[PDB]
Design a protein around this ligand. Structure first.
Ligand SMILES: [Ca+2]
Length: 279
């Protein structure tokens, strides 16, 4: 399949080169997979989700996304126009309030929730969780992310926007999950992206157009926007049978475009997420 005039990041993830504008992907499009977006919520009624989104949990007085961040991330996973995996099922877990804040105890509970809740959902091709959130190092946050992964979910987490080594942030620093850095449309590391040995992969993160609340769209930047490209990629590859939840981060690194990014510090991987789709 080909989507013309796609967001640059979708075109990037199906290309060996920067500077193209068509997204190429197998038509299976993540059908029969599931992706949990653990964030400020998802506006499930947005036409871009086509009835494939729902809220499954909140820790606040509403499950509505009163921020937009979670809706944007969900859209990069799985919206019809803006998404990597255009037929995946999306499940929202609102651990962040409408200011985008959340206590670590709530975030942990939401990760444990997903590990159980997958057993209540139909995801024959596998399960992914996208965590576009983080704060300072916490062994308890990292352990929650490790349990989610161990339970059979492909966990993708943002590296963070501090232009610093991700070893000092959680859940970015957890070794067993897939930690995602950000790039821009000229294959530079994004100015804000964290780096370090704990990174596994980079994805498009500067000037990413996706869904927003009120049935809208906008472009924003962050490791939070790189993470759902990887999460959606994982769902897409699992639907194809090419990998599993336990092996997908390694598969994505194995199959990534290598050596193409600039301003990568010595000791950080130079790997850009790529679907290797041959039309
Ligand atoms: Ca990691």
């Amino acid at each position: 399949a080909a989507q013309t005039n796609a967001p640059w990041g979708l075109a990037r993830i199906s290309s060996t080169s920067p500077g193209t504008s068509t997204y190429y992907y197998d038509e299976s499009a993540g059908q029969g997979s599931c992706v949990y977006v653990i964030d400020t919520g998802i506006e499930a009624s947005h036409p871009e989700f086509e009835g494939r989104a729902q809220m499954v949990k909140t820790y606040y007085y509403s499950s509505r996304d009163g921020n937009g961040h979670g809706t944007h991330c969900a859209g990069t996973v799985g919206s019809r126009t803006y998404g990597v995996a255009k037929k995946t099922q999306l499940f929202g877990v609102k651990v962040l309030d409408d200011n985008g804040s959340g206590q670590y105890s709530t975030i942990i509970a939401g990760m444990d929730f997903v590990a159980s809740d997958k057993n209540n959902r139909n995801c024959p091709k596998g399960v992914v969780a996208s965590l576009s959130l983080g704060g300072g190092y916490s062994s308890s946050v990292n352990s929650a992310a490790a349990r989610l992964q161990s339970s059979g979910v492909m966990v993708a987490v943002a590296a963070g926007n501090n232009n610093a080594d991700a070893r000092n942030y959680s859940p970015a620093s957890e070794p067993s999950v897939c930690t995602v850095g950000a790039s821009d449309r000229y294959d530079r590391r994004s100015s804000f992206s964290n780096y370090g040995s704990v990174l596994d992969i980079f994805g498009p993160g500067t000037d990413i157009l996706s869904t927003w609340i009120g049935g809208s769209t906008r472009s924003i930047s962050g490791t939070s926007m790189a993470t759902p490209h990887v999460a959606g990629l994982a769902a897409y590859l699992m639907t194809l049978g090419k990998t599993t939840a336990a092996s997908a981060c390694r598969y994505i690194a194995d199959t990534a475009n290598k050596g193409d990014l600039s301003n990568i510090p010595f000791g950080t991987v130079n790997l850009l997420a790529y679907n290797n789709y041959q039309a």
